[PDB]
């Protein structure tokens, strides 16, 4: 599959618009992304904002500015001519049912499949909660793609200036287990379709991990053997330094 | 596209059901009767005027009685050579998928010849043949061992529309969440 | 007359798809937009006219406020003439559209052409008229053949926003007598006292 | 239709058709023009044996010589002749056990190969966990309606 | 089980290496040198 | 004298990206924010001006394009006027040219509080952005001779040559300043997203090394044997310690897979 990369310039741009647009009472701020989707790795080097207002009790009322789309063409094209509109982004933690109708408005300006980017403004997740989706023909479905961080001279300089293993993964595995656990509890309470089909894929593919235990410990002892021959070398860098430090002490006594 | 518009009357719905009743019975692709109970197909027609054999097909395929298929399909239908070959293909797939969930406990999906032969009333020569054909179509993965008299079958079919394992797999997620949380607390201490 | 923003709404429903006008009114409604556009454009050198089609296509935003008719005419040919006219969600999204103007001192005005009775309830129009009255939103309702086969469902919307003609709440009805297209809005207080007609 | 039967070949009905229906077999017009009934069937029987051995090698882990001879419709000498030839060509690797009168079609794997395939499953399980994780929000429209 | 004790024996002398080597260097810092 | 100039975290990332247009081609763009008296310059948002072939001159500024963009920024939540503009001088130090003096003087009648910022993205690759600002004089704290710009502290003049020679003598178009950044609590975790999405990549690298576990340790042991002979024939330890460090990272992490 393809890849999606979001620069920290786009990250901080979407996260700052929360307090800039006075977004509260669980609302969203619809932006726009600028990148090159022609390659296999989608990289967004520019982003902007758009005014968005939606009623809480009415999902059929939403405001969008299509005039600002033509305003960035008179600006960005005079600086970077390789910037095009590959889609938009949202500041909400989870998508709603209105995103299906938003794709009809941007399909004329975008020259390719629009990209759906979701950025969590609450920062309540672990790692990179920012996710991306690609709308294709199912009627329509959203194909998720992994999100990475852009590494370039135009970003890491500003990141290092403002700012300056398994234990982290343990908290990440709990998020995947509790997500499926709470989904079953909410399902049984509201009743007594794609999740039920893919749910048993994990159960039939951790009692099954105990059959290879005989072959698992075969390569585990090699790790300790590699550490045993390395442990002897560890003393070679120590005792040798003790001999050198002893010769330094003999010169300090004569002083 | 027939339900929203374009002659939504029951006149075209009863005529369309004649095509699905013949195709779903002979079709070996997705289950046998599984797709009939999900989509409201039989609910749009009546129970009389040669529509009765479609409703009785559910109990005939579920029980597995061979004598029911003789009286269910007369000579005006079974005379086609297609159903003559598919006459034995209906009871082989359902009884094969039934033995998978029956023997399954934790890690053991293994079957044998006596469980398959007594269920389908077929000789051991057809156990390594008719079942092998379903494996090659993508329904199953594991194979059958003729020497040691052991049948090792993997899990492929997602088994849609179950509902019994939903309450059983709920405790599986709790068991997985407790083992990770127990090992996760030891990582913070040391 | 003065500097103001006008939001136009085109009606596309089962009645517009059926026999309406010998010129295929859906194409003549495009000319009806040209009639009011040339009148408001010649009045002031700077004007903002929007286009929103909410009938049968679900609420959408076609083109924003612009002083040229080039992009307005091309977007109408790609729309759909089927569906039903919903003015409940069409008028609510037009209020937020009024904020798209540059100078907020401009007069807010909404001109909508209703050729068919709406199937939506009238309860949402009661609270909508009271909100538009506080912001002084000019309401222009053009009813074509709506009062014949059905009553007025927008009468309750006009009654709550009811104000003298110097501000808002202007209710009009197309004359059933045969006449020219641009003459229907000439006698009505729409293009009167403007640059052209 | 015979192409899709390469994987499902049971060898049972093949000699029945091979001895009855030969439309393109012993009669050639626009390509070979025909040669002889034995020449077209000389390499034909050798290939049909190869189609069955590929299925058994990809299905049966081990099978007795008594049953293998009944599935190949050959003798004991003709059975090991075509099997041993495919081993030298680098196609099918099968260990024939004479005392047990069986042929083991399971190829040996090292400890690193068994643990490598186990690593692909762990990365595959994370794909299903990630996929279902995003389906909760996608299916929230129907659940939250 | 035996391989686990070899790591314990290797790291046991590592901590004692810093104690034995660094201690005699404490007096050379306070004493005045040329 | 010195003062405190606050710059938002979002403004720094945009100025570094704008300066990437080209090294030989100088870039210029506007800024937004507020002020506290004369001693505080708040930089909140920045604007990107179009390029010009005149090399950032007084005639390279377009007020028509400026008025159209600033009116559109009001719908995006920007209530702040223009606090100045930044001009990149890559490859050199922080100094003002003869063109920048005539260009900045033209904006004195428009906004007397405008600030001309000199950013150097070439020398900023070291992890700390080298940047300097220059502000016009609205007086009101000065008139003839006074002492504005409270809280003189932190660094000194530095810069390069011309503007360093005169500080209090001519304060009009140039004088030294300092750079400060103010971040909130929510802006701290914004840059923390670099490190279960990343958990899959941890086991993904272990999958490739699972089949290569025999090949990886084969090159490590044979390398330690060759480095041992070099230490014996010396009668070194630096190259030997580097190999043991890579072996430690390939062992404990590989155990974490179980």
Swiss-Prot record, chain A:
Domain MPN intervals: 4-138
PTM remark: N-acetylated by NAT1.
Q: Name one GO molecular function term.
A: metallopeptidase activity
Q: Does the keyword Lyase apply?
A: no
Enumerate the Gene Ontology biological process terms.
proteasome-mediated ubiquitin-dependent protein catabolic process; ubiquitin-dependent protein catabolic process
Can you list the GO cellular component terms from the UniProt entry? proteasome complex; proteasome regulatory particle, lid subcomplex; proteasome storage granule
Q: Which UniProt keywords apply?
A: Acetylation, Phosphoprotein, Proteasome
Question: Any remaining note in the record?
Answer: Present with 19800 molecules/cell in log phase SD medium.
Q: What does this protein do, in the record's words? A: Acts as a regulatory subunit of the 26S proteasome which is involved in the ATP-dependent degradation of ubiquitinated proteins.
Family recorded in the similarity comment: Belongs to the peptidase M67A family.
Descriptive protein name: 26S proteasome regulatory subunit RPN8
Organism of origin is Saccharomyces cerevisiae (strain ATCC 204508 / S288c) (Baker's yeast)
Curated annotation (Swiss-Prot), chain B:
- At the top level of its lineage, which domain of life is listed? Eukaryota
Location of the PCI domain: 1-158
Further comment: Present with 12400 molecules/cell in log phase SD medium.
* Main function: Acts as a regulatory subunit of the 26S proteasome which is involved in the ATP-dependent degradation of ubiquitinated proteins.
Question: Which family is this sequence assigned to?
Answer: Belongs to the proteasome subunit S11 family.
Name of the protein in question: 26S proteasome regulatory subunit RPN9
Q: Which organism is it from?
A: Saccharomyces cerevisiae (strain ATCC 204508 / S288c) (Baker's yeast)
Which taxonomic lineage is given here?
Answer: Eukaryota, Fungi, Dikarya, Ascomycota, Saccharomycotina
Q: Which gene encodes it?
A: RPN9
UniProtKB/Swiss-Prot annotation, chain E:
Instruction: Classify the source by domain of life.
Output: Eukaryota
**Bias-annotated ranges (Basic and acidic residues):** 22-34
What post-translational changes are documented for it?
N-acetylated by NAT1.
Q: Which family does it belong to?
A: Belongs to the proteasome subunit S3 family.
Q: Its function?
A: Acts as a regulatory subunit of the 26S proteasome which is involved in the ATP-dependent degradation of ubiquitinated proteins.
**Quaternary structure per UniProt?**
The 26S proteasome is composed of a core protease, known as the 20S proteasome, capped at one or both ends by the 19S regulatory complex (RC). The RC is composed of at least 18 different subunits in two subcomplexes, the base and the lid, which form the portions proximal and distal to the 20S proteolytic core, respectively.
| Misc remark | Present with 16700 molecules/cell in log phase SD medium.
Instruction: Please give the name of this protein.
Output: 26S proteasome regulatory subunit RPN3
Encoding gene, per UniProt annotation: RPN3
Q: Which residues of the full protein are shown?
A: 459 to 492 of 523
Swiss-Prot record, chain F:
SUPFAM superfamilies, sorted: JAB1/MPN domain (SSF102712)
The record's account of how the chain is modified after translation: N-acetylated by NAT3.
Q: Does the keyword Hydrolase apply?
A: yes
Q: Name one Pfam family in it.
A: JAB
Annotated residues for binding of Zn(2+): 87, 89, 100
Which PROSITE patterns does the UniProt entry name for this protein?
A: MPN
Coordinates of motif JAMM motif in the sequence?
A: 87-100
List the GO cellular component terms. Answer: cytosol; mitochondrion; nucleus; proteasome complex; proteasome regulatory particle, lid subcomplex; proteasome storage granule
Q: Which GO terms describe its molecular function?
A: cysteine-type deubiquitinase activity; metal ion binding; metal-dependent deubiquitinase activity; metallopeptidase activity; proteasome binding
Its UniProt entry gives the catalysed reaction(s) as:
Thiol-dependent hydrolysis of ester, thioester, amide, peptide and isopeptide bonds formed by the C-terminal Gly of ubiquitin (a 76-residue protein attached to proteins as an intracellular targeting signal)
Record-listed E.C. numbers:
3.4.19.12
Q: Which enzyme class?
A: hydrolase
Query: Which GO BP annotation is one of this protein's?
Result: proteasome assembly
What does this protein's UniProt record list under function? Component of the lid subcomplex of the 26S proteasome, a multiprotein complex involved in the ATP-dependent degradation of ubiquitinated proteins. RPN11 is the only catalytically active member of the lid and serves as the essential deubiquitinase of the proteasome.
Record remark on domains: The JAMM motif is required for the deubiquitination and degradation of ubiquitinated substrates.
Q: Which family does it belong to?
A: Belongs to the peptidase M67A family.
Please identify the protein, giving its name as recorded. Ubiquitin carboxyl-terminal hydrolase RPN11
User: What is the organism field in this record?
Assistant: Saccharomyces cerevisiae (strain ATCC 204508 / S288c)
């Amino acid at each position: 599959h393809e890849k999606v990369t979001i620069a920290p310039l786009v990250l901080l741009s979407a996260l700052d618009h929360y307090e800039r647009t006075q977004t509260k009472e669980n609302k969203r701020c619809v932006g726009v992304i600028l990148g090159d989707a022609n390659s296999s790795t989608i990289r967004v080097t520019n982003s902007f904002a758009l005014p968005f207002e939606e009623d809480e009790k009415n999902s059929d009322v939403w405001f969008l500015d299509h005039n600002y789309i033509e305003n960035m063409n008179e600006m960005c094209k005079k600086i970077n001519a390789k910037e095009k509109l590959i889609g938009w982004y949202h500041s909400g933690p989870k998508l709603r049912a209105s995103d299906l109708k938003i794709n009809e408005l941007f399909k004329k300006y975008t020259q390719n499949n629009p990209l759906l980017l979701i950025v969590d403004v609450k920062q309540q997740g672990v790692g990179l909660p920012t996710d991306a989706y690609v709308a294709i023909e199912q009627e329509k479905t959203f194909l998720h793609l992994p999100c990475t961080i852009e590494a370039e001279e135009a970003e890491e300089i500003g990141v290092e200036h403002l700012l300056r293993i398994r234990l982290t993964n343990q908290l990440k595995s709990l998020k995947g287990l509790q997500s499926k656990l709470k989904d079953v509890v909410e399902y049984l309470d509201k009743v007594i379709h794609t999740i039920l089909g893919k749910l048993q894929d994990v159960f039939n593919l951790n009692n099954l991990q105990k059959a290879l235990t005989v072959k698992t410990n075969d390569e585990l002892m090699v790790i300790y053997i590699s550490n045993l021959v390395r442990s002897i070398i560890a003393f070679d860098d120590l005792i040798e330094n003790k001999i050198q430090n002893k010769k330094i002490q003999e010169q300090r006594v004569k002083d | 596209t027939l339900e929203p518009s374009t002659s939504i009357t029951l006149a075209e719905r009863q005529q369309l059901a004649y095509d699905l009743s013949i195709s779903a019975l002979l079709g070996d692709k997705i289950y046998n009767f599984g797709e009939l109970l999900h989509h409201p197909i039989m609910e749009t027609i009546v129970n009389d005027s040669n529509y009765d054999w479609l409703f009785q097909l559910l109990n005939a395929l579920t029980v597995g009685d061979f004598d029911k298929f003789d009286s269910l399909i007369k000579v005006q239908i079974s005379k086609i050579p297609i159903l003559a070959q598919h006459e034995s293909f209906l009871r082989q797939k359902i009884c094969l998928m039934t033995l998978i969930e029956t023997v399954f406990v934790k890690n053991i999906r293994m079957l044998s010849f006596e469980d398959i032969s007594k269920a389908t009333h077929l000789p051991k020569d057809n156990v390594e043949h008719l079942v092998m054909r379903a494996i090659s179509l993508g329904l199953l993965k594991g194979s059958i061992d003729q020497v040691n008299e052991l049948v090792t079958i993997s899990w492929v079919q997602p088994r849609i529309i179950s509902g019994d394992q939903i309450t059983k797999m709920k405790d599986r997620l709790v068991e997985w969440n407790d083992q990770v949380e127990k090992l996760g607390k030891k990582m913070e201490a040391r | 007359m003065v500097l103001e923003a006008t939001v136009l709404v085109i009606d596309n429903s089962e009645y517009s798809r059926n026999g309406d006008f010998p010129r295929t009114r859906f194409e003549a409604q495009i000319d009806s937009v040209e009639f009011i556009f040339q009148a408001k454009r010649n009045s002031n050198p700077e004007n903002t006219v929007g286009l929103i089609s909410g009938a049968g296509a679900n609420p959408r935003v076609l083109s924003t406020f612009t002083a040229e008719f080039g992009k307005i005419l091309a977007g109408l040919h790609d729309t759909q003439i089927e569906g039903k006219l919903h003015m409940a969600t069409a008028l609510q999204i037009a209020q937020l559209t009024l904020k798209h103007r540059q100078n907020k001192v401009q007069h807010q005005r909404i001109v909508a052409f209703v050729c068919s009775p709406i199937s939506d309830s009238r309860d949402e129009l009661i609270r909508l008229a009271k909100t538009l009255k506080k912001n002084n939103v000019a309401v222009d309702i053009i009813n074509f053949g709506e009062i014949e086969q059905n009553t007025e469902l927008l009468d309750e919307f006009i009654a709550a926003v009811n104000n003298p003609q110097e501000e808002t709440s202007h209710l009009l009805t197309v004359t059933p007598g045969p006449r020219l297209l641009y003459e229907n809005i000439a006698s009505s207080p729409i293009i009167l006292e403007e640059g052209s007609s | 239709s015979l192409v899709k039967l390469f994987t499902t070949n049971e060898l049972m009905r093949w000699p029945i058709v091979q001895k009855t229906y030969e439309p393109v077999l012993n009669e050639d017009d626009l390509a070979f023009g025909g040669e002889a009934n034995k020449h077209h069937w000389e390499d034909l029987q050798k290939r049909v044996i190869e189609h069955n051995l590929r299925v058994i090698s990809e299905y049966y882990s081990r099978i007795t010589l008594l049953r293998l001879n009944e599935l190949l419709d050959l003798t004991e000498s003709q059975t090991e002749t075509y099997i041993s030839d495919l081993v030298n060509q680098g196609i099918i690797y099968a260990k024939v056990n004479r005392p047990a009168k069986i042929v083991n079609f399971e190829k040996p794997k090292n400890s690193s190969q068994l643990l490598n395939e186990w690593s692909h499953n762990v990365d595959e399980l994370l794909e299903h966990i990630e996929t279902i994780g995003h389906l909760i929000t996608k299916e929230e429209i129907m659940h939250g309606l | 089980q035996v391989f686990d004790e070899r790591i314990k024996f290797a790291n046991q002398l590592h901590d004692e290496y810093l104690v034995s080597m660094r201690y005699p260097e404490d007096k050379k810092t306070q004493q005045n040198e040329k | 004298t010195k003062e405190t100039v606050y710059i938002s975290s979002i403004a720094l990332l945009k100025m570094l990206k704008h300066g990437r247009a080209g090294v030989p081609m100088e870039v210029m763009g506007l800024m937004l924010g507020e002020f506290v008296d004369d001693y505080t310059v708040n930089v909140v948002d920045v604007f990107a001006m179009p390029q010009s072939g005149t090399g950032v001159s007084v005639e390279a500024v377009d007020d028509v394009f400026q008025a159209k963009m600033m009116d559109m920024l009001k719908q995006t939540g920007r209530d702040q006027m223009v606090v100045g503009w930044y001009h990149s001088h890559p490859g050199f130090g922080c100094w003002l040219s003869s063109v920048d003096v005539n260009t900045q003087k033209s904006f004195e009648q428009l906004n007397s509080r405008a600030v001309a910022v000199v950013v150097d993205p070439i020398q900023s690759v070291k992890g700390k952005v080298v940047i300097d600002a220059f502000r016009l004089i609205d007086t009101g704290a000065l008139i003839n001779n006074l002492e504005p710009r409270q809280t003189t502290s932190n660094t000194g003049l530095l810069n390069k040559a011309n503007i360093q020679a005169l500080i209090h003598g001519l304060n009009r178009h140039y004088y030294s300043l300092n750079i400060d950044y103010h971040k909130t609590a929510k802006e701290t975790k914004m840059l923390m997203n670099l490190h279960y999405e990343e958990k899959e990549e941890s086991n993904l690298a272990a999958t490739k090394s699972m089949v290569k576990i025999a090949e990886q340790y084969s090159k490590r042991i044979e390398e330690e044997k060759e480095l041992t002979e070099e230490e014996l024939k010396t009668r070194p330890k630096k190259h030997l310690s580097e190999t043991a460090d890579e072996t430690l990272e390939n062992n404990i992490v590989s155990v974490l897979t179980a």
